[PDB]
Design a protein around this ligand. Sequence first.
Ligand SMILES: CN(CC[C@H](N)CC(=O)N[C@H]1C=C[C@H](n2ccc(N)nc2=O)O[C@@H]1C(=O)O)C(=N)N
Ligand SMILES: [Mg+2]
Ligand SMILES: [Mg+2]
Ligand SMILES: [Mg+2]
Ligand SMILES: [Mg+2]
Ligand SMILES: [Mg+2]
Ligand SMILES: [Mg+2]
Ligand SMILES: [Mg+2]
Ligand SMILES: [Mg+2]
Ligand SMILES: [Mg+2]
Ligand SMILES: [Mg+2]
Ligand SMILES: [Mg+2]
Ligand SMILES: [Mg+2]
Ligand SMILES: [Mg+2]
Ligand SMILES: [Mg+2]
Ligand SMILES: [Mg+2]
Ligand SMILES: [Mg+2]
Ligand SMILES: [Mg+2]
Ligand SMILES: [Mg+2]
Ligand SMILES: [Mg+2]
Ligand SMILES: [Mg+2]
Ligand SMILES: [Mg+2]
Ligand SMILES: [Mg+2]
Ligand SMILES: [Mg+2]
Ligand SMILES: [Mg+2]
Ligand SMILES: [Mg+2]
Ligand SMILES: [Mg+2]
Ligand SMILES: [Mg+2]
Ligand SMILES: [Mg+2]
Ligand SMILES: [Mg+2]
Ligand SMILES: [Mg+2]
Ligand SMILES: [Mg+2]
Ligand SMILES: [Mg+2]
Ligand SMILES: [Mg+2]
Ligand SMILES: [Mg+2]
Ligand SMILES: [Mg+2]
Ligand SMILES: [Mg+2]
Ligand SMILES: [Mg+2]
Ligand SMILES: [Mg+2]
Ligand SMILES: [Mg+2]
Ligand SMILES: [Mg+2]
Ligand SMILES: [Mg+2]
Ligand SMILES: [Mg+2]
Ligand SMILES: [Mg+2]
Ligand SMILES: [Mg+2]
Ligand SMILES: [Mg+2]
Ligand SMILES: [Mg+2]
Ligand SMILES: [Mg+2]
Ligand SMILES: [Mg+2]
Ligand SMILES: [Mg+2]
Ligand SMILES: [Mg+2]
Ligand SMILES: [Mg+2]
Lengths: 110, 55, 60, 206
Amino acid sequence: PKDPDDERNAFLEVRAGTGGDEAALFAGDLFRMYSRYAEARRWRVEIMSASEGEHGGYKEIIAKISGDGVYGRLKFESGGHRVQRVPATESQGRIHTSACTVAVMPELPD
Amino acid sequence: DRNRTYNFPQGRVTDHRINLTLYRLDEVMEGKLDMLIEPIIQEHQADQLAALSEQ
Amino acid sequence: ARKALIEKAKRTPKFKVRAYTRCVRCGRARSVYRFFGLCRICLRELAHKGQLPGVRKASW
Amino acid sequence: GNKIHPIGFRLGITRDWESRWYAGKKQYRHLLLEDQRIRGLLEKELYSAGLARVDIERAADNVAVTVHVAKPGVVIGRGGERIRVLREELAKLTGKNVALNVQEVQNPNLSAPLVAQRVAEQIERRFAVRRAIKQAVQRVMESGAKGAKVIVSGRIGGAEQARTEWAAQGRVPLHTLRANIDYGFALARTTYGVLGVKAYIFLGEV
RNA sequence: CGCGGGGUGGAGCAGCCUGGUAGCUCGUCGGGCUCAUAACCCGAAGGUCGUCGGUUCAAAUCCGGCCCCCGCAACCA
RNA sequence: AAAAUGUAAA
RNA sequence: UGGUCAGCAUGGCCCUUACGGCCUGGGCGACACACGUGCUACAAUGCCCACUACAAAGCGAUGCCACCCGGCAACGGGGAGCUAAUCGCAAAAAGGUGGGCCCAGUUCGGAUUGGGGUCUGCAACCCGACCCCAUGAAGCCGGAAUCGCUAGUAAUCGCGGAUCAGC
RNA sequence: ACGCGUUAAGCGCGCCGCCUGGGGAGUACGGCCGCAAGGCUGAAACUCAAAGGAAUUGACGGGGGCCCGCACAAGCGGUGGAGCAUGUGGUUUAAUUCGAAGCAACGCGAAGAACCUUACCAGGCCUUGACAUGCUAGGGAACCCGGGUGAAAGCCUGGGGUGCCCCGCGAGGGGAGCCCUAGCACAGGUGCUGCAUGGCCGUCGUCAGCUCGUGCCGUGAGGUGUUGGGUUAAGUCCCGCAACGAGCGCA
Ligand SMILES: CN(CC[C@H](N)CC(=O)N[C@H]1C=C[C@H](n2ccc(N)nc2=O)O[C@@H]1C(=O)O)C(=N)N
Ligand SMILES: [Mg+2]
Ligand SMILES: [Mg+2]
Ligand SMILES: [Mg+2]
Ligand SMILES: [Mg+2]
Ligand SMILES: [Mg+2]
Ligand SMILES: [Mg+2]
Ligand SMILES: [Mg+2]
Ligand SMILES: [Mg+2]
Ligand SMILES: [Mg+2]
Ligand SMILES: [Mg+2]
Ligand SMILES: [Mg+2]
Ligand SMILES: [Mg+2]
Ligand SMILES: [Mg+2]
Ligand SMILES: [Mg+2]
Ligand SMILES: [Mg+2]
Ligand SMILES: [Mg+2]
Ligand SMILES: [Mg+2]
Ligand SMILES: [Mg+2]
Ligand SMILES: [Mg+2]
Ligand SMILES: [Mg+2]
Ligand SMILES: [Mg+2]
Ligand SMILES: [Mg+2]
Ligand SMILES: [Mg+2]
Ligand SMILES: [Mg+2]
Ligand SMILES: [Mg+2]
Ligand SMILES: [Mg+2]
Ligand SMILES: [Mg+2]
Ligand SMILES: [Mg+2]
Ligand SMILES: [Mg+2]
Ligand SMILES: [Mg+2]
Ligand SMILES: [Mg+2]
Ligand SMILES: [Mg+2]
Ligand SMILES: [Mg+2]
Ligand SMILES: [Mg+2]
Ligand SMILES: [Mg+2]
Ligand SMILES: [Mg+2]
Ligand SMILES: [Mg+2]
Ligand SMILES: [Mg+2]
Ligand SMILES: [Mg+2]
Ligand SMILES: [Mg+2]
Ligand SMILES: [Mg+2]
Ligand SMILES: [Mg+2]
Ligand SMILES: [Mg+2]
Ligand SMILES: [Mg+2]
Ligand SMILES: [Mg+2]
Ligand SMILES: [Mg+2]
Ligand SMILES: [Mg+2]
Ligand SMILES: [Mg+2]
Ligand SMILES: [Mg+2]
Ligand SMILES: [Mg+2]
Ligand SMILES: [Mg+2]
């Protein structure tokens, strides 16, 4: 049972997947999903950078995270997050699917 | 490779790694994500602790 | 919780305030006339059918 | 949906109330609450005989309660029996005199809630659905009327996209007030959901 | 190190000469129009001015040390 | 003369 | 693929000392913000004051409560008349008439607040509504933009029921 | 099909040219021509389940004609600006219950949130329960009543009783409700799903339209009627009319 980061500190990136506008729209959706884990709890989270979204949210994002527990309560999701919604960017009223990428960046010696 | 799958026009979650199709979408998309965060860190008993118990 | 609260209005629990007017068919705490003991919609549908005596389409 | 209710359209115009009585203030409530409850067993029990229409009235306390049906041989029981254990069960929560004078319904093809109940459980029990709308409006048209109409909403045959479908023929002017129209409605519980059936027999001007 | 020019709201530029004197464009946040986004229309937000001494009453401005951007040199006969 | 654009599921 | 499974109904899925059931505090009323609907004003075609006139509707024996008197008062105790074209809520307000202001953040404006009171309802910290003192705030007519209405209609006045112990 | 139609796209014979799914691509390699720019000849790998022609019905048009609505114009007051009330986003929180989303969500469901309403939070209690069917099983009766106990819920625990049924003289048959329990399926859920549905309503919209029958026209989808001239608030009539009637509509 050997490891340092069982419960460490981390950065967190989010990028545009498919869905295009509902790529940046859903990436901003999960932004507030993580942003509300912050100061509804304790955490101090700056955005390090974030390229904008034309119809809302951001395509590229990245957030420097504070408070211990970003690697005991956030570690287990460096992958994809497909979503199936009726996007607020529809011509008619049909259902679509989207997806996004996430990246839990730990803490190199600095 | 998709870690989790959501669905507001159905209200659901599904983490393709446990079996965790167990869902609530609404007050999880709100950000209260300690619902799915727990059984997945509980899925480390059959993982690493089961690796160090006999083999 | 919506069934327990059905009878709770009827039997006056503890005071002359906690006896809110329910509807008799649907059971809604909103729009409940005390004339019919009926919600606006139970009132609606039973009005058109003829089942409410003497009531007809208003117009002036 | 948006369309008008045809019966409410003719209360004191072409069709009289299903229940009728004058009533004092705080008495009206539980006086109607009885009316409705009174039909509780009436809607329940008599359906098996094709419950055409209830017709409640209340004099000085006394409540006469005439009930129409397609074939009353059901309503009577073994002589004076089911028709008696009607009044027995009646006044046992009524408390008012339950003097019922059971009516009759000449032609069940010209009563709409009769055509409704039948078509409805024709799909409950599962049948050809459109045919039973066409046959219905058929032997009801020639069966006494000048015009007739009936509809089915919800899952016809049980498709996921719930269609509506209907049949109709002859001058059926819901806009025109002078028209006698029977609004026949019938719910229809099925394995896959709940079907809506509205009926429209037009019996003539007046 | 030698000389030359530069460093000011987020980006790019004025402002220094003649001190007290902070503007132009973009963008940014708030609002409008619009089905919506840009456009466009209405408002506001934003720099102790490289860095330090110091001159004066007082420094974006004058002066000097150091950090940095850039330009020519450091001739090797 | 004015005046752009609408990603991807029946 | 408008709205509603949260009015009710309803096919399917899930909970089963618990997603079901009871109480009690608390909550839907939180406050750097933003928006929609409205209210009341910025006044002199006005605000204040007493006399004073004139509508319909609509509601009331779970109540509507005259009139006496207490009271600055809200209201309070007393008490009459009604199954109500009987009597009650009821002074309709804009209005007419006398007076008073005197171009000012004012006698316009009534926000906000401190202590002091009545009424409901077990109950008034969150949390009500009315009352008295006092406090007397933004607002001197509205950026870009934007709404209704063609006649008893716009505009502007009071009254009224339903929800309801109260609001 | 459009349209062709003695100027054939008709009926025939003769001769040449050319086509053989779309892209790739009139490109590449070769060959010939050119001063060049380039022309002629002219493939394939790969790739798609189409590419297409005419015609129909719609929708759209910064096309046309004729109409209409407070649509603008013409006038009258108005929020946006202030302070307050109310509803949402948002944020916050222990929870800040849910739904409503341009027109058609935002004084909306709410025609009454202090607890109640109450579906949320928070902590003390319910386990066939606040709730209606019904099964055995221990069986008290009704229970006014009472303390204990607590914020209340609750859980403890007394003092109690002379019912009805049996006629058994009978100090005791069970039956009876209900009280009660533990205890047989049960309940119950405002938990998700309007993108599984009924019903109900908003909405284009009081807009003047939309269809059916038979006939004829077109191989057909379809057309006609329902178009046109006139009139109307209007598919309201009128005259005409390969149409004649009819239903749902305005009436
Ligand atoms: C390049 N030249 C050469 C000129 C002379 N006659 C020859 C020559 O080589 N002179 C060189 C002699 C050395 C001189 N030199 C260099 C370095 C130094 N520190 N000092 C010097 O004097 O620089 C001269 C130079 O190159 O011009 C011409 N174009 N004329
Ligand atoms: Mg490390
Ligand atoms: Mg929330
Ligand atoms: Mg939490
Ligand atoms: Mg009577
Ligand atoms: Mg009796
Ligand atoms: Mg017969
Ligand atoms: Mg049945
Ligand atoms: Mg027919
Ligand atoms: Mg049924
Ligand atoms: Mg320099
Ligand atoms: Mg700079
Ligand atoms: Mg310049
Ligand atoms: Mg200098
Ligand atoms: Mg200066
Ligand atoms: Mg201008
Ligand atoms: Mg300097
Ligand atoms: Mg050099
Ligand atoms: Mg787009
Ligand atoms: Mg498809
Ligand atoms: Mg005003
Ligand atoms: Mg004056
Ligand atoms: Mg005067
Ligand atoms: Mg003035
Ligand atoms: Mg001022
Ligand atoms: Mg201006
Ligand atoms: Mg204007
Ligand atoms: Mg032809
Ligand atoms: Mg020829
Ligand atoms: Mg040819
Ligand atoms: Mg050729
Ligand atoms: Mg080719
Ligand atoms: Mg060619
Ligand atoms: Mg070769
Ligand atoms: Mg070549
Ligand atoms: Mg006209
Ligand atoms: Mg909120
Ligand atoms: Mg909500
Ligand atoms: Mg209210
Ligand atoms: Mg409370
Ligand atoms: Mg005690
Ligand atoms: Mg107990
Ligand atoms: Mg006892
Ligand atoms: Mg005895
Ligand atoms: Mg006896
Ligand atoms: Mg006996
Ligand atoms: Mg014996
Ligand atoms: Mg499906
Ligand atoms: Mg045809
Ligand atoms: Mg046509
Ligand atoms: Mg015409
Ligand atoms: Mg016609």
